[PDB]
Amino acid sequence: PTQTRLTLRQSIELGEFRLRDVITPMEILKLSPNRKYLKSALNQSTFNHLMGET
Amino acid sequence: LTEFDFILNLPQPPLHHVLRPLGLSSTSWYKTISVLNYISHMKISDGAHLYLAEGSGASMSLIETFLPGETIWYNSLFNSGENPPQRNFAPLPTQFIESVPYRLIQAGIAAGNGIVQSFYPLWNGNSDITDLSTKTSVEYIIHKVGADTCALVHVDLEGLERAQVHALLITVTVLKPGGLLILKASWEPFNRFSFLLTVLWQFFSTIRILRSSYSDPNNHEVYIIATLAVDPTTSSFTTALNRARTLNEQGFSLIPPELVSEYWRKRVEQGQIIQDCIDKVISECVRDQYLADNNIILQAGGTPSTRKWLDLPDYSSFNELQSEMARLITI
Numbered sequence: 001p002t003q004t005r006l007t008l009r010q011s012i013e014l015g016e017f018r019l020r021d022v023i024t025p026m027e028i029l030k031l032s033p034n035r036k037y038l039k040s041a042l043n044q045s046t047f048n049h050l051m052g053e054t
Numbered sequence: 055l056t057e058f059d060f061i062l063n064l065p066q067p068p069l070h071h072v073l074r075p076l077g078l079s080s081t082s083w084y085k086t087i088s089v090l091n092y093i094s095h096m097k098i099s100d101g102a103h104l105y106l107a108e109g110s111g112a113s114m115s116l117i118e119t120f121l122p123g124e125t126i127w128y129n130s131l132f133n134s135g136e137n138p139p140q141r142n143f144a145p146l147p148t149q150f151i152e153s154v155p156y157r158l159i160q161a162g163i164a165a166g167n168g169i170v171q172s173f174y175p176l177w178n179g180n181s182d183i184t185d186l187s188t189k190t191s192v193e194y195i196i197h198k199v200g201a202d203t204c205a206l207v208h209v210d211l212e213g214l215e216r217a218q219v220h221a222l223l224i225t226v227t228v229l230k231p232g233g234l235l236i237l238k239a240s241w242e243p244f245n246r247f248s249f250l251l252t253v254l255w256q257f258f259s260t261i262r263i264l265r266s267s268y269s270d271p272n273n274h275e276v277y278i279i280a281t282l283a284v285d286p287t288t289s290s291f292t293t294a295l296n297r298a299r300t301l302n303e304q305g306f307s308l309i310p311p312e313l314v315s316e317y318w319r320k321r322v323e324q325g326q327i328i329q330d331c332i333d334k335v336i337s338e339c340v341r342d343q344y345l346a347d348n349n350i351i352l353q354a355g356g357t358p359s360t361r362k363w364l365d366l367p368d369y370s371s372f373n374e375l376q377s378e379m380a381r382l383i384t385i
Contacts (some may be wrong), residue, residue: 001372002337005336005337005339006337009336009337012067013067013069014067015067022376022379023376023379023380027376027380028379028380028383028384030380031373031376031377031380032377032380032381032383032384033381033384035384037384038384
């Protein structure tokens with residue numbers, strides 16, 4: 001969609017590729033099969049930590 | 055078709071590369087397309103062609119397909135030190151080798167002129183020989199191509215430096231009378247531009263300045279289109295250089311102010327138009343834009359290289375795309 005296309009262009013212009021623009025952690029959890037990974041509060045917290053700008 | 059290029063007869067993101075949707079590695083043929091629109095009328099096919107610092111040889115390929123020469127002397131900076139272990143690779147333009155001219159050379163078919171192109175790289179084994187700033191490189195290049203043997207010389211040395219003046223007097227020595235030089239100048243250091251224009255004007259006639267419609271809209275790039283003056287009574291190159299220093303440090307630049315104003319007036323509008331074109335191409339993502347330019351590339355032997363670098367599938371839905379990384383990241 002043109003909105004995420006625009007925000008990806010903006011992100012690339014400064015010279016970085018932020019992962020959150022293409023797909024969000026809630027989308028990752030929703031669109032992926034349920035597994036033991038990404039099931040515990042600590043596991044979800046560290047997934048979001050590794051999922052953001054880091 | 056991009057016909058926003060203009061001729062003057064005398065720290066930013068590389069967004070402009072989106073308008074270059076064809077070609078493995080370098081794509082300077084896009085900057086060459088605007089040059090062809092003015093050099094195709096005249097005759098440069100006869101005589102040899104010389105390409106200084108051509109690198110990937112993309113411009114060389116696309117010039118060769120439509121403007122074919124008998125002998126072609128590739129030249130770019132390369133040392134054997136960076137070869138992969140147990141390999142003895144010569145400097146070979148990886149874009150020119152897969153192009154139409156070399157593919158037709160290797161299998162023996164004649165070119166458009168009926169004479170099979172003879173492609174000899176200027177390489178005997180010395181790294182200083184590929185570096186034009188050394189005097190040995192100048193002497194060897196002049197030796198092999200032979201003085202008064204070629205008609206077109208394509209110098210694309212990026213931005214006077216020793217290598218530029220060395221490339222200049224390589225051409226002056228080797229061009230046939232009436233031959234053509236295309237030079238990759240740069241307008242932003244205007245003092246260097248005035249120096250270059252004066253020294254070239256001493257021994258070239260019909261000096262034309264052309265800004266490529268496909269060049270970057272921020273680099274003030276100019277492709278000099280000049281012809282070697284017939285019957286050149288110039289004493290030598292050093293006199294031209296020294297005298298150019300005088301004019302540069304004693305009087306106004308040879309470029310008229312009206313031409314500078316014209317260049318700036320056309321440059322601002324060309325940059326704005328090209329920026330809008332790039333912005334529209336990125337946003338709308340219309341599949342078919344400027345088909346003639348890419349058709350020229352296809353005739354030259356260029357192919358879309360995204361097929362091999364991007365082997366990923368083409369999902370028909372955005373939900374499936376997101377789902378694909380939902381699997382990838384979680385796995």
